[PDB]
Every structure is written in C-alpha cells, then in structure tokens.
From Swiss-Prot, chain A:
<dbReference type="GO" id="GO:0003735">
    <property type="term" value="F:structural constituent of ribosome"/>
</dbReference>
<protein>
    <recommendedName>
        <fullName>Large ribosomal subunit protein bL27</fullName>
    </recommendedName>
</protein>
<comment type="similarity">
    <text>Belongs to the bacterial ribosomal protein bL27 family.</text>
</comment>
<dbReference type="GO" id="GO:0005737">
    <property type="term" value="C:cytoplasm"/>
</dbReference>
<comment type="subunit">
    <text>Part of the 50S ribosomal subunit. Cross-links to the 23S rRNA. Cross-links to the A and P site tRNAs.</text>
</comment>
<dbReference type="GO" id="GO:1902626">
    <property type="term" value="P:assembly of large subunit precursor of preribosome"/>
</dbReference>
<dbReference type="InterPro" id="IPR018261">
    <property type="entry name" value="Ribosomal_bL27_CS"/>
</dbReference>
From Swiss-Prot, chain B:
<keyword id="KW-0488">Methylation</keyword>
<dbReference type="GO" id="GO:0000027">
    <property type="term" value="P:ribosomal large subunit assembly"/>
</dbReference>
<dbReference type="GO" id="GO:0005737">
    <property type="term" value="C:cytoplasm"/>
</dbReference>
<comment type="subunit">
    <text>Part of the 50S ribosomal subunit. Cross-links to the A and P site tRNAs. Interacts with assembly factor DarP(YjgA).</text>
</comment>
<protein>
    <recommendedName>
        <fullName>Large ribosomal subunit protein uL16</fullName>
    </recommendedName>
</protein>
<dbReference type="GO" id="GO:0022625">
    <property type="term" value="C:cytosolic large ribosomal subunit"/>
</dbReference>
<keyword id="KW-0379">Hydroxylation</keyword>
Swiss-Prot record, chain C:
<feature type="domain" description="ACT">
    <location>
        <begin position="83"/>
        <end position="157"/>
    </location>
</feature>
<protein>
    <recommendedName>
        <fullName>GTP pyrophosphokinase</fullName>
    </recommendedName>
</protein>
<comment type="function">
    <text>In eubacteria ppGpp (guanosine 3'-diphosphate 5'-diphosphate) is a mediator of the stringent response which coordinates a variety of cellular activities in response to changes in nutritional abundance. This enzyme catalyzes the formation of pppGpp which is then hydrolyzed to form ppGpp. The second messengers ppGpp and c-di-GMP together control biofilm formation in response to translational stress; ppGpp represses biofilm formation while c-di-GMP induces it.</text>
</comment>
<comment type="similarity">
    <text>Belongs to the RelA/SpoT family.</text>
</comment>
RNA sequence: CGCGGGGUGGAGCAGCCUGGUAGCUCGUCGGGCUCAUAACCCGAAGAUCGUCGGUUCAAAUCCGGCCCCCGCAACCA
RNA sequence: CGCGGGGUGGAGCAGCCUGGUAGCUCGUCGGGCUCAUAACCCGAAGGUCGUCGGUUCAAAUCCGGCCCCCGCAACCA
RNA sequence: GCCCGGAUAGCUCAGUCGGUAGAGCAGGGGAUUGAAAAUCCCCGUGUCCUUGGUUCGAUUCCGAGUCCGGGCACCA
RNA sequence: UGCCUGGCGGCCGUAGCGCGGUGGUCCCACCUGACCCCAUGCCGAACUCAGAAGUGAAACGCCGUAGCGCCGAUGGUAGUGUGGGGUCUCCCCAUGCGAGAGUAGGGAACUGCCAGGCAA
RNA sequence: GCUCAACGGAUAAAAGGUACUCCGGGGAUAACAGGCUGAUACCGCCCAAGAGUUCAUAUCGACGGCGGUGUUUGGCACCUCGAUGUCGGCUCAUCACAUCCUGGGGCUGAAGUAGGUCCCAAGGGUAUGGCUGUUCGCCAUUUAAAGUGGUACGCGAGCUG
RNA sequence: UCCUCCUAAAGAGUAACGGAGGAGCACGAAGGUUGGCUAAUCCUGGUCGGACAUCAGGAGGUUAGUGCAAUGGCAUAAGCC
RNA sequence: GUUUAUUAAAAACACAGCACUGUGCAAACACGAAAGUGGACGUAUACGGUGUGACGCCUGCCCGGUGCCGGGAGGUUAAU
RNA sequence: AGCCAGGAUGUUGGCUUAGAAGCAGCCAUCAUUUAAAGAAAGCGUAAUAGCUCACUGGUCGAGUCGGCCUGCGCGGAAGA
RNA sequence: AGGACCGAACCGACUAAUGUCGAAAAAUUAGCGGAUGACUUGUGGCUGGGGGUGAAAGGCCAAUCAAACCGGGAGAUAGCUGGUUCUCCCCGAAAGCUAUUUAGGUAGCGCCUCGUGAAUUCAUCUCCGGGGGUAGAGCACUGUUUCGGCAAGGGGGUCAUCCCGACUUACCAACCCGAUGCAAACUGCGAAUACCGGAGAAUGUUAUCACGGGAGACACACGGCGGGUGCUAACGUCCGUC
RNA sequence: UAGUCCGGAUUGGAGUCUGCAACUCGACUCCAUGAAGUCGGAAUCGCUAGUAAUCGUGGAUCAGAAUGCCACGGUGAAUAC
RNA sequence: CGGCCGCAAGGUUAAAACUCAAAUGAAUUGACGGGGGCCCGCACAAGCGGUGGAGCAUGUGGUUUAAUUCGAUGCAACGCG
C-alpha cells in the first residue's frame, strides 16, 4: 500500500565557497530558504539563490538570528 | 508486557546495534543489575524478569526498571513468500548494549538483592553483572 | 446480585445508649465504621439525629473545630457492619479465595469493593461486610492473612 | 458540437395556439356523517407565469442570451 | 494469508453514499372501547449509532486499528 | 472369610480437606378465589449410617455395629 | 579632552533575561490640546498634528548584582578514513583526524561615525 | 478537443476457454527430490514460582533463557525444461540410537509383584487381520515387544497402478 | 503518471510487492503594489454565556497561521487588514 | 442396439414414447451465387427443428432479466 | 583440619495458641552463672523430652579464608 | 410372433496373461457379448477439406484429423535456440541509468576501440576556500520513557444536602520542576571520510575533453564495508561503495 | 379581549377561633404573592320539564373541621320528525 | 393386517390391543341466536350542558411506610361503610 515516491529534485548547493561564476549562475537550489540573498545575489521565486554579477562566492553568517547568506565577492 | 502507549510510526527499521550503553550508574536504588552482553530484551523477558526478582524481595525495598522495549520488532506469518511489504508488529524489545543498568533496587539487605538478581538475570538472555551505586 | 434490612432493624435499636439514654435516632458513620468493642463518640447532625463516628477520629475531631459542644457520648447496649482491605498479589482465582472462605463461613458479602489496577502485580481489593459475632472476626483474620496471593487482609479503617 | 422540445402555486401539471386579465390533482384542515372506524360529500386551505434584458399602451405571451433537464446527432485526435 | 459488505432504540430495517438536524414497522409504556382479553382508537417515551483512536469547528456519516457477523476466493500443486 | 468403597434436608443432589451443615425441585406461607391455576410478594427445609472414643471443633480420625456396590476365596 | 544623550551601523546571546540602584540642565519618554493636515472597519489608544505646564512612575539608558540563559577549554570517552587481526550478528591493533555531553574556568559586551548638552 | 490514468501515449475501434490441443525457447521461471536455511517442527539443557499431605528439583513444572538435529510445515530457486514417470502396497533391504523388548545400573513419593524416571547398550528381536488406495488412523485379537527415524519422505532399466 | 518525508551511508543521484502521507485542483482574489498589523494557549475578571461566542488584562511566546499532504521555509514576515 | 479403428463400451449416444415449435404446398429447412433438387412424386394423423427419453404416479411458484410471438398510437428513426 | 567435653538457664519470655515450653505468629534482640549460650541455625515431640547449632575451652601445630582479576582448559556435546 | 432365448460359422471386442527393438505399426492365447436382425457381407456407386460424414467420441475421411493429402505463395515469420571454419599483434567493456503492450528485446546515455584535434586539461598529495547533518551525541523541540517532588482537576468521604460551601483520603491524577533512558521519517550539537572550487611541486608512453568511424553491453556472482528487506536465516533478496 | 382589573393555585408574612393541644394535621382573616389554564384526544355523562342549565339559603355529622351528602326555594330554556 | 377388484385414486371384505361410562333418539321447561314478529325506556335519534385537558377537593389503585387499620373493588366499589 506504499512504495510511492516523488523524484528527487537535484537540490542542494550548486556553488561552493571560493568558486567563481557568472551572473545568472545558480548558486543554490534550496527548497525553503536555508539561505538568503547577499550583495549581488538575487533570489528567484523558487528561492534559487543566483548570481547577479560575475565573481567569487562566499557564505556569510551575518544577521541577528545567524541566518546564513550567500554573496558574490565582486571579483 | 511493558510496551509503548500510542507510538508515532508503527513498524520500525531493523537497525544494527552498535556502541556502548548510556545510563551506567545505578542512580536510584543502592543496588542494580548492569548488563554485559549486547542483545535485545523482549517485553516478555523484561516483565518476566521483573516478576522473577520481585518474587524474592517479597515487596519490601524498592525497584526501578532502567530500560523500556519501545522497538517494534516485526515478523511475518509463517508460510508466506518474501516481499509483499514488511510484516506485523509481533512484539516489542529494547536494544541493549554492554554496560547498561537495568534493575536498580534498594531498601533491602544487599544479600537479598544479590540473590534476586541471580534469578532475574537467570531469565535474561544477555549476560549481566551486579553493581552498587559507588558515590560519584 | 446479593446487594435497608439493617436500617429497618437498627430501628429495632437498643444498639446505642447516648449519654444515659438509648432510642435516639442514630447511625454508624461511614468514616470510622464503629465496632461494638472500643465504644464510641457521638455527634448530633441537624436532621437524621445522632451520627456516631466511633470513639476517636479526625472527621469527628474536625467537628470539634466547629461545634464541639453538640458532640455527645454513648456505648453499645447490644460486630455488625464493617469493611476490610485485602491488597494482594495479582489474583488467579483469588477473588474465589476470599469468597471460598466467606461462603458457609457465613458473614454478609456486600463489600464488592475490589479494584485491580495499580502498576505492579498487586490488585487492590476491599470488602465491606456485616459480620455478626466478634469471635467470627478473629477466625477470618487468621484464615485471610494466610492466603498466598494475600499480603494483607485486615480491618480497613 | 449543433438543433430540435421544455421548468407554470407544494405540485401532475392546462393557458400559448389567435399579447393584457392564470387552471387541474394531489398538501392540509374542518364540518358532514360516522355501532366506531370505513367510506363517502362540500368550502376553505392555493404561483405576479423556469433566469435576466429587448419590442409593446401592457410581456405568460413574441424574441435574444442563461442555468438545468430531455432526445437525436458529429464521439476517426 | 486474501478481497468485498455489514454492526443504528428491546426486533427488523432505513438514514452513511455526497460532514451539521436519525425516520419507518412491530414491540414497551400511558389512556379509551369491552363483562374480560385481543383487535381496534387516542397519546407517549425510547437510540452515548460495534469499540478505540484519529481527521474536522463539528463525525451515525470522512479515515485507521481492534472484536464480531456474512459474502467471494483459496487455482496450476 | 478377608479385602475395598457408597450412605448428606421430603426427591435429586453440594459438599467436606480434624473446625463452626448448602445449593436446585417440589413443599408450606401471604395477596386473590369457595378452593385451585395464572400472576404478585415471603420463605423454611437435615440425629452428616448409628455410636461412643481422639471430639473446645469429628461432618471430614478410628474402628465396633448397618445396608449398599465390587473383588478374591472356600468346588466336600 | 572626559562624561551624557539621540540618530546610524559593525558584531549578534561573554552581547540576553530576572533582581537591586539610579538620571530629566539639555536629550528622551510619557506628557497637553486637537477648528484645521491626517487618522479610527468604534476609539487621537495607535496614527497625525498644535504644543508645551507636569513628571521621571512607566519606557529607555547607565551602574551594580550572576539567580539563570549564554560561552567554554585541557583530558578522556564515542566515532572514524587507511592498513592489518580475532572469539568477524561486534570489536582489537597500528595510525591520522576526533567529537557531542560533562568539569575548571569565562561571564553581566566591545565597537566605528555623526549630532546636540555638560565638564574642558 | 483524450482518466490516450498501463499516464513517452502499438488501433478510430477488441473480451474469454482450450485436460482436443500445437510450436519455438528456459532450470533465466514453478510442481516433486536434492542443496543452503532452521523461522516452524522435534529432542535436549538452564532458572525455577508451583503441584507433589510435610519437602521445588521421586515424579511434572509455569513465567523465562540457551541449545542440538536436519525427520515435519516452510523460506530461497543453486542443480534438472532436448521427460527426476508422483502416494501406498509388494519384494529386498542397510544404517543411526534420541531404546519398544530382551541385558546392565542409579534414584524412587522403590516393602514384594509391578511400575516412574534418568544413565549405559544397537547383538538380536522387534505382529496377524477389519475398514480405507492410504502411509496414518480407529478397531479386533495377540506378542517379551509389536521402536523413532535416514537411506531420492530407500527400493518401478524389480512388481502393482 | 506527479508531489513530500525516510531508506540514501553529512554534495548530486541511488533500488525493492520497503516504511509513511498526498495531487489530477483552487483564486479576478487567496494576484500586484503602498500603508499598517502579527499570533497559540492557559491564568483572572466580566450580562444572558455554559469545558469553549464577545470583552478587558496578564503570563506566554509563534506551542499559530500559510487554500490542501509533507518537508524546508517564513515576523524585514511569505503570516493578517 | 451404438460409441472413442490403434488405452475409455459406460452411467455417454440412440432409443420407442411425451411436449414444445416451425411449416398451407413454388411449404419450413437444407444443398446451391443460380437454374435446380432433397423435403416428396409427401401434403398438418405430414415434414423439419428442439428438449426430454419405455411404463407407473406425476410435471408445482416466477414474465422481473434475456429471447421469442403479438399490438402500433406516440418519441427516436435510413437512403430519398 | 580432626577428636575430649561445655553448649545452660531465668523460663512455660509475655501474648498467642485444646498445648507452641529453643524454632505456627507480632514482639524481643533484655539480664543471669558468663569459657560461651540468641529468648535459637537445622532436625524432632500433643506440647514435652530429646540429637545437633552458632559458640567456648582442651591436643597438635603451620599458615589459613572467601571474594577479585584475568591465561588455558572440563562438562555441557546424539544420526543415519 | 418376437431388435425373444442357449448357441457354432458370422460380427464384435469386456477380462487376464503373453507380446509390448513383437509372429503383428493393437495381435495371439484363454475365456467374453450379439448371433431373424436398428444384424452381416460381396460388388459397384454417392457425399470433399471450414467441406464431407457422423446412434455424436471432436470420432472417421487411405497407418495421419480441433480442419486431410500433394503441390503452389515460399528461403512464410521466427525480439527464440543451435551453429558460425586459418594465424599473429595492440586495446579491452558491461551486466548501470532513462524509456518501452518493455522487463531473457530494443533505443539514446554510461563504459569499449580506431581516427583527427585542443589547453598543467586530468588523476595523486600538501596547503587554502566551501556547504553540509550521517556515525556519534543529546533530550530544548516532535514523540516516547521510568522514578521522585509539587499537584489542579477526577472519585471516596466527614459535615452540610435545597444550595453554597468547609475540612478529609494509606484513592486516580494533568501541568510544570529534578533525576532517567529511546528515534529512519525527533535536533537547541556534530565528526571522519566524501564532493566542489583555488593554488603549487612531483610523477604518469594525454592519463582529459570535444568531434568522428565501428561496437559490445543493458541476465550479473561472490567477499569486505554501510544499510533496506528477511529471523541482524539462506551460496536469499534489494541498493551504495570497494 | 390582554393571560389580561380574567384565573386563583401556590407561597411568605402577620392573625383570629375552636380545643389539654393546631408541627406532622384544622378552619377562617388580613397584606402580599399570583402558577396551570384562552373551552380540552380517543372516549364518554345527565337531562323532556319548573327539568337541563345557572344561583344562593339551610341541616344532620359536629369542640372545631364541606368543594361531600341531604334539604330549600330563585332564576329559567332547547328539542323530540 | 391379509385377500379379491382397480392403471390410479382407491374400492370391497373387515378385526384386535387399547380406552371411557357414557354415546345416542325424541320430546320439555328455560337461556341464547350476528332468527322473525309486536311493544317500551333519555335506548337512540333532536337538542342543552358536562367529565375526560387545566389547578384544587375527595375516594380508589399502585407505590411507599415501622403503620399508611379493616371492608367495599364490572353494570350494582371508587364524595363508598
């Protein structure tokens, strides 16, 4: 009466710290908002944090509630 | 037949048993029965042991179980081919790893306890040992 | 099924002589179960006349802390009615063990006050009765402290 | 998908046909009468017309969309 | 082991399907007619909807386990 | 002849463990009738085979005497 | 230049609560009135406005207190990649990494900028 | 404009029986035997509340625990699809011993007789019929006893069918 | 067929007639924006009003809500006007 | 009596008898594109189909479902 | 470790119980002559009595006692 | 008279044995039933392959029948099987994924080979930058758990009993507090390894990627490790990984 | 034209009389209170004349204690084919 | 039961055991008949007003009680002794 299941959505991080990318590149495919936008980091509706400018990538922990952020180091 | 009162998930994964115990100090009665082996205590064995031990101490002093089954071991009705879903919650057991206290006791002469645990443990599957609450 | 005749016959009275006089409306209280032997102490309720509460007891003492003056003294004139707790190990036909003895042992069996629950293997059974002869009380206690499943079977109070 | 018909008192349900102005039987009640009912017989008890607009002095009506139902029919993506 | 259906006043059945408010028949009860009973006539109560838990604002009803009851199946072996 | 067991309120039956004699059916009682039944409300009911002894408790111990159901054995 | 206080941050519970004390010249709050701007699905409570007698209670901030929250080693234990072993339904060893928990202890923040007040 | 829901959608449009059967394959995929397994089944062992009038362990022993065998009910498809032709009877057997009898012992809640039980021991012995296809079983009547099992649940290039 | 969680061995993915639940829509507003607000649930008090309508206060803290199942998420709110 | 020649002889089949129903003679039905023939050189006491299966006592309730026959007003109704 | 002997009594501890006097059961856990003797560890009697008991001293005369930790073993352990 | 009777020839074929590479491609032997009839036999005609015929068994139709025989479509078709012939040299798989009236086939991709072409492309390590939530851990949360403390409210009660209400319990007991464990679908923690990214040295017949010619393969087995399932049974089964 | 100045039960308070005595258990008075009831289902009763109907008066019983019984007149029909 | 007859249904012949002290014919007086005739009464019909619903009085059943003394209990007991 079970055995049914979705189909993994290939989520998780797609860009790690120190990595360099172009604007339009997708940094993370989070389902909720495990993260939040940072400088030069737009947040698509799917909460798909992405690059708004070419450069490096970093994972800030800023914010009063220790929410993590992602920011494109303007490299 | 000690057992969980209204669970969460019905059937549970087999789950390998590894590592050492936890509550290793008789934190209640002055005396207890620590467990050396690494097996599973059926709800039947536990309760049975309780009655075993209780029979000795009449009813003086005080007891404390230190475990609780809470793991729904499932079997399958005999003469059934494999697959077709996980079986049925036949009975409950508590995973027991080396060094786990089980029956703390007190208020009774140490000797009577030393005698009772001989019996209670005698009914238990896993090999066990006697202990005393050494201060700190 | 065997569960009035007492109140119809305690009306025959002569059972209590209050401060030099009997025939007063009265009744043994349910908070002491006064026994013929060790006399009593009586209290006067507004209605239903005198309320015997057995000699020496708290509720009777609580009244002392309200209207102690109303309280009165009496004896017995001429061991009917009482309860007995028999907390015991499990049961296994033990319910018969109480009754087996009680059967042609005679005494009334209206104390269907059993309660088998607790945590351990120790069912809490109680029994009100209306035993007659005081001697009968003794034979019971010896014949009921004996029972293997029984750990206690004596005058609940 | 088109066309052929049609929701009228609570209601089976006529009026339409040939514009104004609306019937039937079951709903009930009572009296009647009743060996006692039975039965049986009379009035009361009863919708501004399937939904909303056009033309008309006036809209059931005569007509447009409209829900629901009833049939055929195109069911070869 | 399996699939489907049912458990509702004292009896038999609704109502469940498609959430809010459980009705019918006999039966029980109260009065009447009768010399008396039934029948008949008047009037009335009576059902925690198998059990537990859940879903919900709310469950007789929706969902799951348990106990009961019946059905269909248990083939090639 | 020896051995083994049964006898319990009127009928059928409970029992009992050396300790304070019951259930069921009839039966009787009360209401009602002339008296019954139906219906209604109540109830008792026994030297435990006898008997003494061990008996404060024997009814459960013990024979002695009773009948009663089996078994062996005197086959002159 | 030292203390205040207000705005804006960095950082983000060593920074937060509770407890005790404390400040009104300024600043802040509350405060006063509300024809008018604006506002209430009723209400100037909030919002908004005109103001300023009153006050430091509230709030706020500062100071003190650790009753907690919070931080947190060292050591050890658990685990563990890799290579071996056994009594291989689990563990032992060599070996590199190595916790969470708990203990000693720490601990009632620090900080940059601007603006006005006081003391310089 | 499709529950084209078997949801990448063979058609616009389609259900069965075949022991009358047939073909090409497979031990990839079953039935039976084997093999691994031992849940289950059997035998034994621990603890032992309790029964045994007294007393646990003469004799049984619940709640529980660990085994041993590879007889059962099974699980797994490793062997066999180019035929393993399945139960019982018959005939012929051979082994194990966890022993039914006989032989030797201990204990007995064993006076004797006769038993209860456990230990040793496989030399030999270890029914005839009734009914049923039965093995089995119930029954009749014996016997010192009418063992439990393995051997392809022995045995069909030996028989029966 | 599709979604959610676990198995899944801290990236992705990963099977079983493994364990657990869902969807085959809904909305013109439940969308967009600007402004504003932020709960649950107990304690107390309060007309009818009672375990529980509304009200006032407090403690409490998001234990709430998010059209629907789950998970991640959400007060700068995505929650509510 | 018949029956599976070459594993089945029966309780299978046939069977006389009974009933149903068809059929008016250029019959019904069948063979056959057809002419034509069997039916029959017969014509309802006949011929085909069907069920049953000597005889004896019998052969009950059901027209909802399906089919068959009958009714033709009304809705639906093809080529035209 | 053996053997000689003592192991009592106050006393029937009180209550209890047809008796329970050293041991059904609650209490006691007092003292006595003390080498020592509790209102008895086990047995036994209607209760009694009575055989032991812990214990106390005699003789000999060197170690001795039970737990603990682990190395390696024995039983447990029967098939065609 | 008779589908009458016993009964040979005649017709048949119930029983047993033999035979069952026979004497025989269904018989002999011993017995069987019918044997004046719906009997039997000669000869010669007639009925034809979805047709005949049939006292009906799917029996018979030339030793063949649930659709004869011979020839012709015709080398039917065969995701099935079997087989596939001389030699040396070089490389060397997979038994996975996704999709399939597909699941023992096939298709694209993964892995193979040959060829052309390209950059420290790539692999190993040290170092740096990263997210993770697993093992472990823990119990604040979701659930579950034992004991203790406090304890509303629930019941027994005494008094009162219309009612309020007041004490009382060796009775059940929520919540919170203290100690205590358990979790795959619990997390206020959290490794190692693993993966991605950056840089640098060393070694590696480019080991890498892209394009192109040809594939095979898509049945996997075991062992260790981490698990699901199963009984932490199976040389069991289902994945990851080596 | 209302449960209404209808209704008068019930109930509190305060009294009177009888009688050893009025709580169980009297009657009657006063103040207040002020319900059910808005012509009654099935069914059923009396009655033809001074009757029915309606109205009040009285008596025995009786210390006291009639809405009963018994008795008396007042008023005064309908209908019977 | 046997025998005979019959296709059958049955028919014809025709016992016993057992069982009671009646069964039975007619006729008589009554009672009755949802038999007929004749006649009457508040019997109905025609009307007037009622109980049954309401609260209260009183009796009764039933219930309760230590006692609700005893009796009356279709019409002809139930404001009855």
């Amino acid at each position: 009466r079970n055995g049914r299941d979705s189909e993994a959505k290939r989520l998780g991080v797609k860009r790690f710290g120190g990595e360099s990318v172009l604007a339009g590149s997708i940094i993370v495919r989070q389902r909720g908002t495990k993260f939040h936008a940072g400088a030069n980091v737009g947040c698509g509706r799917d909460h798909t944090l992405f690059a708004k400018a070419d450069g490096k990538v970093k994972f800030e922990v800023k914010g009063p509630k220790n929410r993590k952020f992602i920011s494109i180091e303007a490299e | 037949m000690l057992q969980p009162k209204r669970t969460k998930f019905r059937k549970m994964h087999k789950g390998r048993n590894r590592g050492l115990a936890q509550g290793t100090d008789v934190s209640f009665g002055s005396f207890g029965l620590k467990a050396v082996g690494r097996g599973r205590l059926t709800a039947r064995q536990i309760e049975a042991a309780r009655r075993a031990m209780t029979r000795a101490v009449k009813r003086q002093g005080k007891i404390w179980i230190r475990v609780f089954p809470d793991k729904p071991i499932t079997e399958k009705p005999l003469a059934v081919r494999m697959g077709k879903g996980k079986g049925n919650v036949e009975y409950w057991v508590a995973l027991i790893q080396p060094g786990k206290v089980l029956y703390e006791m007190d208020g009774v002469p140490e000797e009577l306890a030393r005698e009772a645990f001989k019996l209670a443990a005698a009914k238990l599957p896993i090999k066990t040992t006697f202990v005393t609450k050494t201060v700190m | 099924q065997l569960q009035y005749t007492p109140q119809n016959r305690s009306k025959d009275n002569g059972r209590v002589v209050v401060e030099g006089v009997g025939n007063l409306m009265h009744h043994i209280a349910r908070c002491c179960q006064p026994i013929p032997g060790d006399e009593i102490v009586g209290f006067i309720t507004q209605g239903r006349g005198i309320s015997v509460h057995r000699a020496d007891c708290e509720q009777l003492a609580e009244l002392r802390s309200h209207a102690p003056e109303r309280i009165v003294d009496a004896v017995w004139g001429e061991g009917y009615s009482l309860v007995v707790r028999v907390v015991a190990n499990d049961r296994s036909g033990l319910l018969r063990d109480i009754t087996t003895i009680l059967a042609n042992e005679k005494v009334n069996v209206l104390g269907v006050a059993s309660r088998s629950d607790t945590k351990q293997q120790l069912a809490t059974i109680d029994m009100t009765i209306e035993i007659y002869n005081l001697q009968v009380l003794g034979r019971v206690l010896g014949k009921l402290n004996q029972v293997p499943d029984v750990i206690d079977a004596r005058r609940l109070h």
